[PDB]
Amino acid sequence: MPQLNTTVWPTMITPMLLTLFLITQLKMLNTNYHLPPSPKPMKMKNYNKPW
Amino acid sequence: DIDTAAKFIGAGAATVGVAGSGAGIGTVFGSLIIGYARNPSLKQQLFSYAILGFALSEAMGLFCLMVAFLILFAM
Numbered sequence: 746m747p748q749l750n751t752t753v754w755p756t757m758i759t760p761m762l763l764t765l766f767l768i769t770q771l772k773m774l775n776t777n778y779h780l781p782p783s784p785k786p787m788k789m790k791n792y793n794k795p796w
Numbered sequence: 797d798i799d800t801a802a803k804f805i806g807a808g809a810a811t812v813g814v815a816g817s818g819a820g821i822g823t824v825f826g827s828l829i830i831g832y833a834r835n836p837s838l839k840q841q842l843f844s845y846a847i848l849g850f851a852l853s854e855a856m857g858l859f860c861l862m863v864a865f866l867i868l869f870a871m
Contacts, residue, residue: 746869 807868810860817857824849 828846832839 746865749870 803867803871807864810864810867813860813863814857816860817854820853820856821850824853 824846828842831842835842
């Protein structure tokens with residue numbers, strides 16, 4: 746079983762860490778979801794005429 | 797050699813432990829059919845439980861294929 750060849754293990758451990766923990770994560774941060782725009786048509790800080 | 801020979805019987809025997817996951821997986825995806833036929837509105841929550849059961853079931857199944865290959869090659 747080549748999986749048990751413990752000599753090239755450091756060749757798999759590092760670039761995974763360089764891919765699972767740095768690169769791919771750095772692409773999810775660049776996938777943002779904005780809150781959808783429903784600005785209410787009812788925003789009027791008004792007041793009765795001067796009386 | 798008696799060692800190279802016994803490795804074939806030992807690795808062959810430990811593979812029978814996969815028969816447990818063949819049956820356990822059939823029960824999970826069998827109960828998912830029954831459980832979904834009664835409350836189909838929970839389809840997404842039921843399936844979440846099937847995968848958890850499928851994984852934990854097949855987990856015990858691969859522990860056997862572990863020993864099956866631990867004996868055949870790693871020894």
